[PDB]
Structures are given as C-alpha cells and as structure tokens.
Write an enzyme that holds these catalytic residues in place. Sequence first.
Site, PDB file in Angstrom:
ATOM      1  N   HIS A 110       0.917  -1.277  -0.053  1.00 28.02           N
ATOM      2  CA  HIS A 110       0.098  -0.136  -0.026  1.00 28.02           C
ATOM      3  C   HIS A 110       0.786   1.275   0.137  1.00 28.02           C
ATOM      4  CE1 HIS A 110       0.199   0.179   4.371  1.00 28.02           C
ATOM      5  NE2 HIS A 110       0.076   1.238   4.503  1.00 28.02           N
ATOM      6  N   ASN A 121      18.565  10.943  12.028  1.00 32.22           N
ATOM      7  CA  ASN A 121      17.943  12.118  12.038  1.00 32.22           C
ATOM      8  C   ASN A 121      17.366  12.730  10.934  1.00 32.22           C
ATOM      9  OD1 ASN A 121      17.063  14.847  12.593  1.00 32.22           O
ATOM     10  ND2 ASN A 121      18.020  14.982  14.662  1.00 32.22           N
ATOM     11  N   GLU A 141      19.023  16.097   9.888  1.00 31.00           N
ATOM     12  CA  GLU A 141      20.390  16.680   9.943  1.00 31.00           C
ATOM     13  C   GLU A 141      21.252  15.540   9.293  1.00 31.00           C
ATOM     14  OE1 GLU A 141      21.084  16.325  14.128  1.00 31.00           O
ATOM     15  OE2 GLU A 141      19.990  18.302  14.513  1.00 31.00           O
ATOM     16  N   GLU A 196      24.144  13.427   8.704  1.00 29.04           N
ATOM     17  CA  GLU A 196      25.065  12.696   9.640  1.00 29.04           C
ATOM     18  C   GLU A 196      25.998  11.810   9.186  1.00 29.04           C
ATOM     19  OE1 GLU A 196      21.171  11.304  11.076  1.00 29.04           O
ATOM     20  OE2 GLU A 196      21.771  11.471  13.375  1.00 29.04           O
ATOM     21  N   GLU A 221      24.283   8.390   5.699  1.00 31.83           N
ATOM     22  CA  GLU A 221      22.848   8.152   4.919  1.00 31.83           C
ATOM     23  C   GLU A 221      23.231   7.824   3.573  1.00 31.83           C
ATOM     24  OE1 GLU A 221      23.770  10.960   6.222  1.00 31.83           O
ATOM     25  OE2 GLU A 221      22.241  11.420   7.733  1.00 31.83           O
ATOM     26  N   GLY A 229       2.915   6.136   8.844  1.00 30.61           N
ATOM     27  CA  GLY A 229       4.317   6.683   8.653  1.00 30.61           C
ATOM     28  C   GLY A 229       5.553   5.692   8.764  1.00 30.61           C
ATOM     29  N   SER A 266       4.563   2.315   8.470  1.00 27.12           N
ATOM     30  CA  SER A 266       4.038   1.270   7.557  1.00 27.12           C
ATOM     31  C   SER A 266       5.158   0.733   6.751  1.00 27.12           C
ATOM     32  CB  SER A 266       2.785   1.810   6.756  1.00 27.12           C
ATOM     33  OG  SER A 266       2.394   3.288   6.851  1.00 27.12           O
TER      34      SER A 266
HETATM   35  C1  LIG Z   1       0.667   5.667   0.033  1.00 28.88           C
HETATM   36  C2  LIG Z   1       0.146   5.236   1.769  1.00 28.88           C
HETATM   37  C3  LIG Z   1      -1.285   5.064   1.838  1.00 28.88           C
HETATM   38  C4  LIG Z   1      -1.841   5.001   3.029  1.00 28.88           C
HETATM   39  C5  LIG Z   1      -0.931   4.984   4.245  1.00 28.88           C
HETATM   40  C6  LIG Z   1      -1.885   4.686   5.804  1.00 28.88           C
HETATM   41  N1  LIG Z   1      -2.723   5.324   6.048  1.00 28.88           N
HETATM   42  C7  LIG Z   1      -3.324   5.068   7.068  1.00 28.88           C
HETATM   43  N2  LIG Z   1      -2.683   4.223   8.110  1.00 28.88           N
HETATM   44  C8  LIG Z   1      -1.525   3.806   7.888  1.00 28.88           C
HETATM   45  N3  LIG Z   1      -0.858   2.966   8.852  1.00 28.88           N
HETATM   46  C9  LIG Z   1      -1.088   2.646  10.292  1.00 28.88           C
HETATM   47  C10 LIG Z   1      -2.322   3.107  10.747  1.00 28.88           C
HETATM   48  C11 LIG Z   1      -2.537   2.991  12.166  1.00 28.88           C
HETATM   49  C12 LIG Z   1      -1.565   2.028  12.953  1.00 28.88           C
HETATM   50  C13 LIG Z   1      -1.890   1.645  14.331  1.00 28.88           C
HETATM   51  N4  LIG Z   1      -3.093   1.866  14.757  1.00 28.88           N
HETATM   52  N5  LIG Z   1      -0.975   1.203  14.975  1.00 28.88           N
HETATM   53  C14 LIG Z   1      -0.575   1.538  12.115  1.00 28.88           C
HETATM   54  C15 LIG Z   1      -0.191   1.915  10.799  1.00 28.88           C
HETATM   55 CL1  LIG Z   1       1.170   1.345  10.137  1.00 28.88          CL
HETATM   56  C16 LIG Z   1      -0.965   3.919   6.449  1.00 28.88           C
HETATM   57  O1  LIG Z   1       0.269   3.207   6.258  1.00 28.88           O
HETATM   58  C17 LIG Z   1       0.445   5.057   4.011  1.00 28.88           C
HETATM   59  C18 LIG Z   1       0.867   5.253   2.690  1.00 28.88           C
END
Ligand SMILES: Cc1ccc(-c2ncnc(Nc3ccc(C(=N)N)cc3Cl)c2O)cc1
Lengths: 232, 49
Positions: free
Chosen positions: A41, A55, A58, A60, A63, A181, A183
């Site tokens: 996704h 970070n 910054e 470092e 990278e 973020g 994910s």
């Molecule tokens: C391009 C694109 C499209 C959609 C998304 C995306 N949209 C929503 N939620 C996501 N993740 C997420 C939400 C909740 C929790 C939790 N309750 N622990 C953990 C995760 Cl990983 C997510 O990856 C990211 C990139």
Amino acid sequence: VVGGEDAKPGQFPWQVVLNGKVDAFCGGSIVNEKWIVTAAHCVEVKITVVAGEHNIEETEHTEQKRNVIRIIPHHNYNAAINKYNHDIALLELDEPLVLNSYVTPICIADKEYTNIFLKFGSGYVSGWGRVFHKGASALVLQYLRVPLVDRATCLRSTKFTIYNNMFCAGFHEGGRDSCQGDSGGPHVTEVEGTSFLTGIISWGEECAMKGKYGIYTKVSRYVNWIKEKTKL
Amino acid sequence: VTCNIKNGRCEQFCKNVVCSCTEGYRLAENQKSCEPAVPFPCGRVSVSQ
Ligand SMILES: Cc1ccc(-c2ncnc(Nc3ccc(C(=N)N)cc3Cl)c2O)cc1
C-alpha cells in the site's frame, strides 16, 4: 511510533525510509544491497529510499539515498479488493548500498523458523511515523518493543477482517504502538543477538487507543517469494 | 538430542541433530553457535551503543 524511544545511531541498520510525494511517508527493511521489502500500500509514483538515516533533519554522513528502478508488489496484492491484504512489496535500487555499521541487511529465516520466531511473542518495530494519533512525525528514528497479541483477542478488537497471515501486536491499554508513516517498516525478533524479520508494519485504526492493536503482515507467508525475487 | 526439545541446542537452525546458520554466518567450533563469516552479517548491531 507512539510512546517509543529515540534509536541510537546504527541500532536498527536494516531500517530505511521512503520519500515520494511527501518525505518519510513509509518505512522499509534492507533485504540485501539491491533490495528493500516494504508494504504494497506504500508503493501503490517515483520513490527514493534512504538507508543509514537516524535524524531526518540533520546530515550525519551515514545516509545512502537511492532511486527505486523496479517495484514488485506480491502477485496476490489487489488494492481495489483490499488495501491491506497480501500487503508486501519489494523495491530494487538503482545502485547497490554499501554495507557498513549503519547499513546492514535484516536476516530472513525459512517459513518454519520465521513463524517460530514470531511465536517467541516479543518483537521490535521502528520508523519515523507519527509519535501521537493525528500528530507530528518523528525526526529521530523511534523504536518500540511490542508483545504479540493472541488471535482471539485480536479478532475481538476490530470489526475489520484480520486474515490468518496477519498478526496483532501492542498493549492492552494502548499508549504505545506503531502509527501511519511506520507502515512498510520492520517487525523483528532478536534470536540470541541476531535480528530476523518476522513482520511488516501494515495498518491499524486509532494509534495507541486502548482496545486497538497494530496489524502486521506475517513475513513467514512470503519468505520463498522474497528470496526468489531478491536473489543476487 | 532432538530439534523438538530446546532446538537441539542450536543457536539458529536445527535439522534431525545438525545445526545451521543463516547467510553471512558459519557454524562455530562447538557445532551449535553461529559466528560472523562476513564483515557485516545480517541482523547485527556493530556501532557502539
Ligand atoms: C501511500 C499510503 C497510503 C496509506 C497509508 C496509511 N494510511 C493510514 N494508516 C496507515 N498505517 C497505520 C495506521 C495505524 C496504525 C496503528 N493503529 N497501529 C499503524 C499503521 Cl502502520 C498507513 O500506512 C500510507 C501510505
């Protein structure tokens, strides 16, 4: 990661961050010098990967940034049917990463042992995702140890479907969790000082809300495919 | 004596016992432990913490 800690430099050297329309929108894990494993996704658009990041605000000098020349979502991924089922993809880099103390692959055991290690019941997740529900993203890489949650408890936590090759992880009272973020990033299990990839950070509902858990893809389900497509 | 009890004492992988390790590691002198066989083996922290 909500309620985590700042990772020290080189503490999770397999972690990468993805940049696209927005910077640091997803994470990933180094399979080898040319390949990253992430959630499908995330890459469903031109992407760049940054390895050796600590970070994000910054320089470092550890990278290594690379362009993605090929994206391979698992053949059973279909976003029009389910955005988060079969949620795994591989990214091939334009030029190989140089392995060092800040840029090191994650180990991946066979199907059997990846399932055995997941069942040890305690893993580490990391990423630059949101540090609060609907909040700001992290500047320093965050990490958190999350316990595995039994499937019956997991099914009762949500109205959404949790398939057998997905798993729940987190705390009964919330407060600490993965978040948007993070994910695509790794869920790893330490086996006597060597970390193995046991899950991909996938989805969830409200981050860190009591009664809700983070949902992850079982890596055991995809080990043959990962090793076949990433062969050097 | 068997993988079904303490993983046959193997640090990583067991087979009915014959211990083995993931890529980048070799089976140590004791035939149970796994040790680095390359400069930067997978899944290990090498910066000082
Ligand atoms: C391009 C694109 C499209 C959609 C998304 C995306 N949209 C929503 N939620 C996501 N993740 C997420 C939400 C909740 C929790 C939790 N309750 N622990 C953990 C995760 Cl990983 C997510 O990856 C990211 C990139």
